[PDB]
Design a protein around this motif. Structure first.
Motif, PDB file in Angstrom:
ATOM      1  N   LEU A   1      -9.418   0.630  -7.589  1.00 55.78           N
ATOM      2  CA  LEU A   1     -10.077   0.355  -6.308  1.00 55.78           C
ATOM      3  C   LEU A   1      -9.729   1.367  -5.224  1.00 55.78           C
ATOM      4  CD1 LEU A   1      -9.825  -3.527  -6.156  1.00 55.78           C
ATOM      5  CD2 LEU A   1     -11.964  -2.165  -5.979  1.00 55.78           C
ATOM      6  N   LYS A   2      -8.438   1.678  -5.093  1.00 57.89           N
ATOM      7  CA  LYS A   2      -7.962   2.657  -4.120  1.00 57.89           C
ATOM      8  C   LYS A   2      -8.448   4.077  -4.414  1.00 57.89           C
ATOM      9  CE  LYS A   2      -5.787   1.006  -0.601  1.00 57.89           C
ATOM     10  NZ  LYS A   2      -6.597   0.979   0.645  1.00 57.89           N
ATOM     11  N   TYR A   3      -8.446   4.466  -5.689  1.00 61.64           N
ATOM     12  CA  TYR A   3      -9.006   5.750  -6.071  1.00 61.64           C
ATOM     13  C   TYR A   3     -10.470   5.828  -5.666  1.00 61.64           C
ATOM     14  CZ  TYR A   3     -10.608   9.718  -8.915  1.00 61.64           C
ATOM     15  OH  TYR A   3     -11.166  10.908  -9.346  1.00 61.64           O
TER      16      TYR A   3
ATOM     17  N   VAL B   1      -1.282   8.963  -5.678  1.00 59.30           N
ATOM     18  CA  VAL B   1      -0.630   8.958  -4.366  1.00 59.30           C
ATOM     19  C   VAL B   1      -1.673   8.835  -3.264  1.00 59.30           C
ATOM     20  CG1 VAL B   1       0.856  10.255  -2.754  1.00 59.30           C
ATOM     21  CG2 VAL B   1       1.356  10.274  -5.213  1.00 59.30           C
ATOM     22  N   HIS B   2      -1.493   7.833  -2.404  1.00 60.41           N
ATOM     23  CA  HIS B   2      -2.458   7.516  -1.352  1.00 60.41           C
ATOM     24  C   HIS B   2      -1.829   6.786  -0.166  1.00 60.41           C
ATOM     25  CE1 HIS B   2      -2.375   4.138  -4.229  1.00 60.41           C
ATOM     26  NE2 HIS B   2      -2.452   3.393  -3.142  1.00 60.41           N
ATOM     27  N   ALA B   3      -2.501   6.871   0.981  1.00 63.52           N
ATOM     28  CA  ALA B   3      -2.094   6.147   2.182  1.00 63.52           C
ATOM     29  C   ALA B   3      -2.549   4.690   2.116  1.00 63.52           C
ATOM     30  CB  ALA B   3      -2.658   6.830   3.428  1.00 63.52           C
ATOM     31  N   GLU B   4      -1.651   3.785   2.507  1.00 62.28           N
ATOM     32  CA  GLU B   4      -1.940   2.351   2.572  1.00 62.28           C
ATOM     33  C   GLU B   4      -3.144   2.116   3.487  1.00 62.28           C
ATOM     34  OE1 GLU B   4       1.549   0.049   0.926  1.00 62.28           O
ATOM     35  OE2 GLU B   4      -0.070   1.344   0.173  1.00 62.28           O
ATOM     36  N   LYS B   5      -2.979   2.475   4.762  1.00 64.13           N
ATOM     37  CA  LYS B   5      -4.082   2.515   5.728  1.00 64.13           C
ATOM     38  C   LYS B   5      -5.075   3.628   5.370  1.00 64.13           C
ATOM     39  CE  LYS B   5      -0.135   2.768   6.506  1.00 64.13           C
ATOM     40  NZ  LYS B   5       1.167   2.143   6.881  1.00 64.13           N
TER      41      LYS B   5
HETATM   42 AU   LIG Z   1      -2.325   0.997  -2.496  1.00 65.88          AU
END
Ligand SMILES: [Au+]
Ligand SMILES: [Au+]
Ligand SMILES: [Au+]
Ligand SMILES: [Au+]
Ligand SMILES: [Au+]
Lengths: 125, 125
Positions: free
Chosen positions: B39-41, B59-63
């Motif tokens: 989902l985040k990707y 690797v990604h930002a929460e917000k």
């Molecule tokens: Au996440």
């Protein structure tokens, strides 16, 4: 004579959509419009260029790629592929717009094109 | 029973605007909706997540911060500050939209706010 010179230069720039180049900015810049460096800094950044910086060591891409909403709507419209080529739903236009944001202004890459095509289809079917 | 399970899961996801999660995608994903990683990707990238990847090392930002056009229009509208708070010119909305693209989806920083404020004023005065 100095005021009119600044107003004249400023008027030329505003006619071009270079919004930062007010008569005050031109005066602070020594009665000259922006250099290529200052224009490119503003274009890529949308911050007012420092009238003191020449930005000749500012590193940037020649090809700039930033899209207006008109451009996003045309892209959305040709991907969506609705009969009579009418406007796509706002939900689909938002998805196209988000791709432009992800890409720092650039249009869809090949993988994003597929995702958008699928999205168009699911919204039609 | 397997087809309906995939269709049911897919129907849940589409109701949420998760457009990639078709019944075929859910089947390829082993009759499960996407993991948080997938989902985040997709959210950050708008490319279809690989049904084989868990993206737990992605690797990604929460917000996340990505804006729709509705959001850009509200931002443009409050910066422009027109009486009766009517819609700003399209030229000003395009400038606000470009700031969102420059910022990979985020709203104006302090320097960009100034530039936009100046732009609003020059377009009014
Ligand atoms: Au996440
Ligand atoms: Au350049
Ligand atoms: Au189909
Ligand atoms: Au970026
Ligand atoms: Au003024």
């Amino acid at each position: 004579a100095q005021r009119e010179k600044d107003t004249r230069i400023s008027k030329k720039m505003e006619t071009m959509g270079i919004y930062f180049a007010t008569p005050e900015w031109v005066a602070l810049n020594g009665h000259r419009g922006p250099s290529p460096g200052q224009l490119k800094y503003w274009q890529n950044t949308r911050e007012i260029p420092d009238p003191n910086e020449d930005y000749l060591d500012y590193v940037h891409a020649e090809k700039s790629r930033l899209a207006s909403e008109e451009q996003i709507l045309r892209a959305a419209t040709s991907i969506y592929g609705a009969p009579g080529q009418a406007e796509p739903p706002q939900a689909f236009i938002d998805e196209v717009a988000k791709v432009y944001e992800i890409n720092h202004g650039r249009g869809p890459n090949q993988e994003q094109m597929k995702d958008l095509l699928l999205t168009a289809m699911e919204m039609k079917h």
